[PDB]
């Protein structure tokens, strides 16, 4: 008899144990959480507006000929502003994939610029990490620009940039313009305007969303905290809740503000989680602001929101798409529980199941490889020919990589977890492809964390078998109750 689990595309995955019965408040991000933007239409829109901004700022007209390719970028890549490389790294800074423009650099060639295949993530001045879903157009745009100036006769390829005659143009300064142009497109309203004049093309609409939020408000409180203003929030949220019937069958429609006990616009994260700004009330009918204490607020801080709701830290589950540093934990008051929305998880779960032949063949090659060394020890002079097997492993592994995209899986490359995956294991108590998967779990559910096995755990059976004394080293009242309570959330 095996353990029961819900369907794979309906599950909420557990990183740290969480008792849902103790949750009193449900907090939501808006962008890419409640308002899931259609891929790759939204990435293509941000890509176009950023290219237009760069062209209107002095960049050549050939950039207008670029088109966003959703098959290339993968979230969490590191851009080397010194050499103009997009880097896929592991949890400790080791290099997994290195792309200069559109050319993927092989192993021995990589050691010319990275002698130990290692980068220091601390070097924030040199390395820029593209972790957000808004960074997806920026990720592909950086590759197009490095590719363009590298294969352009008017420019001269160099180690740290390009030459336009007797004038040098570094990757760092070029990266600055791309950074300023993306900030411009987002903070000038160019992207917001094109979005709210065509919600059906860019914003996903689902009736499951008002159903889950209504059930959350029956067992506790629900609040919204978005960096966007109220105007853009009102248009987006009205679209997300525009249905002829209400949540329950046969019921009538009610405004989206009815599902929230507290609505907070202009959050200004991540400053929001520290001191933030002064909290000010918002008059929706007029747009007038007034500091101090309706349900629509502006600015403030996460602690001010925590106090207005009468909740405490661990009573809140914050649901969003963003990964934040250990700045909320460093506070002297309790931090929130986290639910990380990872939209890529939908396509990655399809590869995990609908490509079983690639996984099964990969395991068969490893069993066959282990048989060739089955009879060998430190006295064996033999060297079994594995060139044919390894060459087949690399082909199958690469075919699996291309199932996710040119940059491979978001969570791993081969046997190594990516830097992004380790940041998920750090920040997210729970994670899924969408917050809507909570609809398939009771509000009294006990989310239990799955053990993450080390090599000496996953490759050793619990079955019972002289041992060398070099390993055994020749081999206060004890507690009677459990010394830890991080698996029951009690």
Footprint (CB under 8 A) of its own copies, residues 379-398: 379-380, 382-384, 386, 390, 393-395, 397-398
Ranges within 304-343 binding its own copies (CB under 8 A): 304, 307, 313, 326, 329-335, 343
Q: How far is CA 443 from CA 17, 111, 189, 221, 258, in A?
A: 14, 52, 39, 13, 21
Q: How far is the CB of 395 from its own copies (least distance, A)?
A: 7
Using the rule CB under 8 A, give the single segment among 188-196, 220-228, 250-258, 424-432 that binds its own copies: 424-432
Q: Which of 138, 157, 160, 135 is nearest to 148 (CA)?
A: 157
Total number of residues shown for the chain: 490
Cα Rg of the chain, angstroms? 26
- CA dihedral (94, 96, 102, 107) in degrees, to 10, reads 90
Q: What is the DSSP letter of 35?
A: B
What count of other Cβ atoms lies within 10 Å of the Cβ of residue 283?
A: 12
Q: Which is nearer to its own copies, 244 or 465 (CB)?
A: 465
Q: Does 165 bind its own copies (CB under 8 A)?
A: yes
- The 399-418 contact track toward its own copies, x by CB under 8 A, reads --xx---xxx--xxxxxxx-
Task: Return all residues near 231 (Cβ < 8 A) that are at least 6 apart.
Answer: 287
Of 153, 250, 388, 481, the one binding its own copies (CB under 8 A) is 481
Give the nearer residue to its own copies in terms of CB position, either 26 or 260: 26
Residue that has been written with the tokens 């080397």 in this structure: 80
Cα–Cα distance, 185 to 51 (Å, whole number): 10
- Strand pairing category for 446-447 and 168-170: unpaired
Encoded one letter per residue, x for contact with its own copies by CB under 8 A and - for no contact, window 86-125 reads --x--xxxx-xx-x--x-x-xxx--x---xxxx-x-----
Contact string (CB under 8 A) for its own copies, positions 168-207, x = contact: xxx-xxx-xx--x-----------------------xxx-
DSSP state of 145: H
Instruction: Name the one range near its own copies by CB under 8 A: 189-197, 223-231, 252-260, 432-440.
Output: 432-440
Q: Using the rule CB under 8 A, is 440 a contact of its own copies?
A: yes
Report the distance separating Cα 213 and Cα 219, nearest Å. Answer: 10
Binding residue for its own copies, selected from 151, 238, 291, 294, defined by CB under 8 A: 291
DSSP notation for 199-221: HHHHB---THHHHHHHHHHHHSE
Stretch touching its own copies by CB under 8 A, among 45-53, 190-198, 226-234, 365-373 = 365-373
Which residue in 22, 52, 69, 295 binds its own copies (CB under 8 A)? 69
Kindly determine how many residues on this chain lie close enough to bind its own copies according to the rule CB under 8 A: 206
Contact 411, 421 (CB under 8 A): yes
Q: Which stretch binds its own copies (CB under 8 A): 2-10, 188-196, 257-265, 315-323?
A: 2-10
143 binds its own copies (CB under 8 A): yes
| Residue 215 near its own copies by CB under 8 A | yes
Contact indicator for 70, 43 with CB cutoff of 8 Å: yes
Residue 247: CB minimum distance to its own copies, A: 11
């Amino acid at each position: 008899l095996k353990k029961y689990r819900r369907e794979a595309y309906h599950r909420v995955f557990v990183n740290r144990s969480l008792a849902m019965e103790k949750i009193k408040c449900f907090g939501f991000n808006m962008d890419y959480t409640l308002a899931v933007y259609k891929s790759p239409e939204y990435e293509s829109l941000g890509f176009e507006l950023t290219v237009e901004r760069l062209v209107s700022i002095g960049y050549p007209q050939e950039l207008l000929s670029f088109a966003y390719d959703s098959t290339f970028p993968t979230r969490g890549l590191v851009f080397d502003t010194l050499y103009g490389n997009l880097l896929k790294v592991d949890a400790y800074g080791n290099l997994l994939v290195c792309a200069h423009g559109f050319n993927f650099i092989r192993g021995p060639e990589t050691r010319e610029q990275y002698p130990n295949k290692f980068i220091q993530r601390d070097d924030t001045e040199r390395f820029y990490i593209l972790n957000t879903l808004f960074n997806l157009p920026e990720t592909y745009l950086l590759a197009c620009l490095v590719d363009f100036f590298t294969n352009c006769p008017r420019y001269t390829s160099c180690e740290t940039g390009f030459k336009d005659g007797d004038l040098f143009m570094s990757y760092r300064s070029m990266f600055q313009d791309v950074r300023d142009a993306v900030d411009w497109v987002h903070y000038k309203g160019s992207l917001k305007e094109k979005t709210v004049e065509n919600l059906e093309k860019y914003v996903v609409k689902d009736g499951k969303l008002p159903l889950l939020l209504s059930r959350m408000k029956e067992v506790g409180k629900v609040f919204l905290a978005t960096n966007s203003d109220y105007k853009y929030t009102d248009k987006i949220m009205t679209y997300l809740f525009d249905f002829p019937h209400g949540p329950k069958p046969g019921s009538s429609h009610r405004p989206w503000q009815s599902y929230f006990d507290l609505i907070l616009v202009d959050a200004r994260k991540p400053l929001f989680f520290g001191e933030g700004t002064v909290l000010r009330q918002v008059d929706t009918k007029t747009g007038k602001l007034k500091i101090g204490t309706g349900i629509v607020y502006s600015g403030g801080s996460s602690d001010t929101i925590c106090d207005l709701l009468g909740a405490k830290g661990k009573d809140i589950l914050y649901i969003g798409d963003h990964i934040f540093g250990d700045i909320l934990k460093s506070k002297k008051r309790q931090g929130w529980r986290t639910f990380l929305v990872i939209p890529e998880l939908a396509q990655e779960l399809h590869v995990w199941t609908d490509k079983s032949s690639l996984f099964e063949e990969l395991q068969s090659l490893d069993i066959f490889l282990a048989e060739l060394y089955k009879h060998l020890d430190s006295s064996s002079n033999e060297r079994p020919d594995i060139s044919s097997i390894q060459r087949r492993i690399k082909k199958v592994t690469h075919d699996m990589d291309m199932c996710y995209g040119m940059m491979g899986s978001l969570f791993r490359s081969g046997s190594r977890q990516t830097l992004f995956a380790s940041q998920v294991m750090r920040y997210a108590d729970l994670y899924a492809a969408s917050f809507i998967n909570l609809l398939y779990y009771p509000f009294s559910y006990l989310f239990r964390a799955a053990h993450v096995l080390m090599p000496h755990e996953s490759t050793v059976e619990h079955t019972h078998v002289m041992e060398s004394p070099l390993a055994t080293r020749n081999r206060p009242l004890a507690p009677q109750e459990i010394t830890h309570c991080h698996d029951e959330d009690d």
